[PDB]
Design a protein around this ligand. Structure first.
Ligand SMILES: [Fe+2]
Ligand SMILES: [Fe+2]
Ligand SMILES: [Fe+2]
Ligand SMILES: [Fe+2]
Ligand SMILES: [Fe+2]
Ligand SMILES: [Fe+2]
Ligand SMILES: [Fe+2]
Ligand SMILES: [Fe+2]
Ligand SMILES: [Fe+2]
Ligand SMILES: [Fe+2]
Ligand SMILES: [Fe+2]
Ligand SMILES: [Fe+2]
Ligand SMILES: [Fe+2]
Ligand SMILES: [Fe+2]
Ligand SMILES: [Fe+2]
Ligand SMILES: [Fe+2]
Ligand SMILES: [Fe+2]
Ligand SMILES: [Fe+2]
Ligand SMILES: [Fe+2]
Ligand SMILES: [Fe+2]
Ligand SMILES: [Fe+2]
Ligand SMILES: [Fe+2]
Ligand SMILES: [Fe+2]
Ligand SMILES: [Fe+2]
Lengths: 155, 155, 155, 155, 155, 155, 155, 155, 155, 155, 155, 155
């Protein structure tokens, strides 16, 4: 069926491409958060184990909402290691850093998702894609709150 | 009691008339979805009976939130067959189509409501009615997602 | 597949037409109750806003139960403005009455549905359709209880 | 201790005999629906697996309500394969039919239960046993609704 | 407001008087069951304490339903020691019987309420008050089942 | 089996005597609250119908706690119309007052229970029955708060 | 579609034959337990009515898991009176024994299912079917625990 | 750690200052609503006791959410009597008005919060702080809905 | 309506003034705890953020219980910054202390409420106001427990 | 840091010692009840298995509340076998009594805890430890109620 | 701190390596199932969308459990795209297959995980690691069951 | 009654002897964990207070499951201080260690329970006691997981 929702095929494709970057970033942050949740040690084990669990749990829902916005726009959602490693702007950590370095990396990762989302807005303004604009806003709200919570631990 | 929320009486009346068409479209889609939920038949009965129940259940909430934004703006909310037929841009199915046709009509229904919501955004462009704009957006998200789920069934 | 439930084709169709009128009254009353819920004002707003909410929420379930008794009997359930306006015996209200008058009409509404339900029991005398007799009975109980609670507000 | 509920010993014994048949049909249908729930295959596996799950789950309460009405009437409730195969009128299926045939046998199964319920009302005409009457009524209504939903799959 | 539910004042008043007797019996049984719940002793304390608790909890809702059927019929619901002693046919117990006599007495209690219910049906023959007939049918269901459970303890 | 909880038999029997008055007062107020919940009418019906439901629901628990404290002191708990009419200091209402009068009587009912409770404290202090003293305190808290809400309606 | 789970077809068939016996035994104990739940009488009625309900409720889940392990091994699951009376090794009770004998029959029924499970392990060890061995282990845990609870009543 | 969320320290501090006024208004209205909840009298006591409870409950969540957006922007959140007194624009009531005056003062308090929020948007449009704008918007939607409900009581 | 709960006007008024100080102390501790919840930083952020949230959530309910006991005594509940600044014995904090200092201050705050409540017992014993005495006792228990938990963090 | 809850080191120490006896008694009774829960046999198995489970579950919460009152008083809470064997007045049982002897021992254990509790009120009379006195009273309430339920089984 | 759980360091390392492959396999199947959940289309959309959600939701729990068993054995859990790509034996799917081919791929995926799990048992038997063996068995039970449900759709 | 479950009397007795050591160990660890939950102080108070509560809560269920396996094997379950201090292999701590030492002892406690379980498996393998073997496997899984979480805090 034709898709008649007030955005042309070429603009939908372009929003889908930006959202694909956002998805890869969110999913990469999801796995890293899940990773640090397993692997963190030291006197903050209990608090960071729990904190990270709440974060990756929220991220899993976000991954699903971002992907399904892509589907609503008429495009398949990417979902492989290869696609996400290419599309993602988050630094992957292959070892096991100390707790404070895990915290910093996760702070940076929240800001990376925010940065990716800020890059998509001018496009959304130009085509007046209000639903996608609201989704980006919610993600920034969540990632900027999570950033305050994480960095507060470092003071 | 004087209403002082930063939108003038004339402005609020135009917005209320906009939302009144959204409401009527939403309510008309509600009943059509409820109809098809009762009357669909075929090997897709169980999944369509259920999917349509989820849709009209969500729409019952939406009509109430729309009706009550009208009231917050200071105007009665319409609620009769006569006033919805007048305001509704959706054509009702008086018979019982095949299941594929039901699905096709419900996709068109979602798109009809998205259309009505887009027509109201300029009204707000002047007056700084952020709450109504968010409501229009939330409705576009829901209907654009439901469009995807419905049409995916055709493929 | 043939229907073999101890009721013949001609009878099932007659009972279906009966319930189609009960459906139409229940739904029209549902919409009016939901209407008054939005638009009532005065010192009884909170109590009436809440009472009418409870009422239309119950009626939404009743319409579904009535529609699906129709399908059980082997006939389509009606569900459009035009079909309900034809079949309905409910006094439509297009304006916004004072609170006391909303209560009064809502009382008459309950008694209208009771009346429609009573109009159907003779079709079940010779036929012995106990399920429909129980459905009719339950609606009478609910609508007569609601009539008491509403008219008590006037006294 | 004497049983004094307004029904004579020979009347109760006779209603119990009839409910013993209803129990045996319901239980036989329960087992068969559980059978199909496990063994059905084909593209409708997910919908029928769940649909048959919902039905046998409801029938598990039914068999218990029927048995305990027999105990209320002051007689033992039957509960062995031997007693249920004697009393049952459901055609038992020893193989694994295709999905469409599983559905038809369950449509018949519902109609078989309704038929048994109807054969019991005359016993109650003479004696005024309103509880048992309402039990047959509610069983008739569940099975007739279930039969609508099952046969809607075949069109 | 005129009450217009298909039962005239004179017939409504006769039913109300019948229900007032049923309300008084149910309530006197509620208090007796509550009494025994507190005062029973001996090896069956735990099982009877609990069983009786379940019975009086269900009776507390029944009195409310009966009383409110009387209001629906348009008459006041009795609620004083004086009025219940007058209307009630339950033999009050002023001492503390042994557990087995408590049980036998609560069996008689159940049968007594059934007896009162069985007496009201003729007033309904003439008038066709289907909601009230269903109320009595339910109460007979509950007390007859309860009577099976209670007397089973004595064998 | 002997009771050895730090209170001699005759002191326990005196405490139970007071608690029997408190019980009878609580149950009488329970029934009158239940009565007014059924029978109250006028503009306040919804709010009073509800408020009295919360009150009698609470009192039904209190009745049970008072009765079981009597049991714990080793005495039977009174539970008949005759014992409660004798023990109760609450004047019953055989008619149907206006709503403002219902409120008025229920306010005084709370104070009647507080008065019975206050009379028992000197005995509790004398024999140092801390649990009963705490129970009476809780009832006074509840009844005094309830009086404030009732009488707030009259201003 | 091919089944490739580390167990050859002939070995899976032999596992399915053992589980078909386990299934029939579990379902037979299910019906018997359900029977005794209905029909038991005497001073232990309340405790045995509830204890037997817990058991048959858990057995209903068990028959579903056993059946579906058969399905996962690639064979249809037996589900008729004929198949179960043939595959089952538990003597059914056609009558209504005393409470003490019902308990005894149920202890032995637990041991009967355990005995059938134990006969299957040498096969499971030979072919290394770890999931089925765990399923049998879980059944033995439940049946041996239930045996202890039942026989504890007789002492 | 640096804060890199797309907004420079200077604009963040000014957004923080505007939110501090929003927080002080929200919290002052919270306490006043709590106050009126405790102290309102008259026939509308139940309705407003409950209504004001719902309002201050919601407002307690809102003060948390505003305070934590301030923290996410990198500034401390004010939380003292002195600070909220300096920062709030809401008239404080040192006595106990009549109910109508309580309603009117709370209608104005909604509108004052809405007005403080409208004063903040210019700053956020110039800086594309989408999360804070959504926060301001939700606050407006709630207070404007609350103002409809409250003023509706007066008519 | 007169207040008759066994305590004269003058005594009730002196109790209300004591409870007014208790309320002011509790609300002031409530806001300071909320303040610290928002603004604490350092490696204990997560544990203190959560701990302080549990504390202020509990104090919100205590605020409401203290104020409503004032009302039950027949006096209006104070609730404004002016009243609480006048009545409160708690040292307020206008900056953002280090985590260890926040803890120590919250310990002090617990002890200040205890101190205020201890100051009120002499009056309660002379007049036998048992409910208010139980209230103070519950507050002292809660605050002395919270003090153990807070001060345990310092060790 | 320092403890300023108005009791004074020497008295807190005396009260802690008494609560240490209470804790030891409560915990010894917890284990004994748990022991009888596992080991009881005979016709009362189900009822006492469940009843003893209800009791030890409640005691688990009580040992925690008693221990933490000791901590609130500024002293460590004992918790080893050696300590509890020293502080405890409860008669340890090394075998498996008959059911009736199990009940009798548990009655005696409730009374042992009551007796220990009563020995502590004098340490409090001088000192004004309202929270500890309330804890003793709640424990006495629970154990005296449990004593009634237990000994009711013997009568 | 030393790990003393009855398994030497070298064997723990080797078990951790096998579980790492299981983890990578499980997580790759997680993402693919999640991918097909977003991207599947056609008449089975609703059923497969739901079915795949159930599966990936379960797999998300399994990835956590497998990783935390690796942590209990004393070794870091892998969690990056590069590490899973290296360890995983699952075939990635970079496009959007037809629904029948999605099904067949997920069937194969279940079998691949089962195959990885079977490869680990030999090591588990040399060293008696019961918990890890039980983990492998549970995973095999889940995936073999899922395999049946999936391939049942193809038939 | 004869216990017939495939294990002879001397073997069951030897299993019960091993499970009695396990139980004693589990119970002792339960009390020590509860002890440290009360008495731990320092900046980790909040996180260990909570962590230890989770552990001791789970150990109370384990205590119950191990004891009831002993009962199901036909032997009494030990439950006294004297028997547990004799059967148990865990060092009792009679003081209040520093937090890190509490963690250390709790790690060793988990490993002590594992060690006791390891000593029992050879017997279970010899006689093929599958249920007890699964119970020990679960206990090893829980304690090895807990050992990881505790020692992760030390690092
Ligand atoms: Fe975890
Ligand atoms: Fe999804
Ligand atoms: Fe439905
Ligand atoms: Fe609404
Ligand atoms: Fe609303
Ligand atoms: Fe429906
Ligand atoms: Fe299933
Ligand atoms: Fe049952
Ligand atoms: Fe009780
Ligand atoms: Fe009611
Ligand atoms: Fe009601
Ligand atoms: Fe009770
Ligand atoms: Fe039952
Ligand atoms: Fe199943
Ligand atoms: Fe309140
Ligand atoms: Fe917060
Ligand atoms: Fe937070
Ligand atoms: Fe309140
Ligand atoms: Fe148990
Ligand atoms: Fe605790
Ligand atoms: Fe979805
Ligand atoms: Fe985890
Ligand atoms: Fe605690
Ligand atoms: Fe247990």
């Amino acid at each position: 069926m034709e898709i008649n929702i007030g955005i042309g095929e070429q603009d939908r494709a372009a929003i889908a491409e930006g959202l694909s970057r956002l998805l890869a970033d969110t999913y990469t942050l999801y796995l890293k958060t899940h990773n640090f949740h397993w692997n963190v040690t030291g006197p903050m084990f209990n608090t960071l184990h729990l904190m990270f669990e709440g974060q990756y749990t929220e991220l899993a829902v976000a991954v699903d909402d971002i992907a399904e916005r892509i589907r609503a726009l008429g495009f398949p959602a990417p979902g492989t290691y290869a696609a996400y490693a290419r599309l993602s702007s988050i630094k992957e950590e292959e070892g096991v850093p100390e707790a404070e370095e895990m915290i910093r990396q996760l702070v940076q990762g929240q800001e990376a998702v925010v940065r990716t989302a800020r890059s998509i807005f001018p496009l959304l303004d130009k085509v007046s894609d209000e639903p996608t604009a609201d989704l980006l806003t919610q993600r920034m709200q969540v990632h900027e709150k999570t950033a305050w919570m994480l960095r507060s631990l470092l003071a």
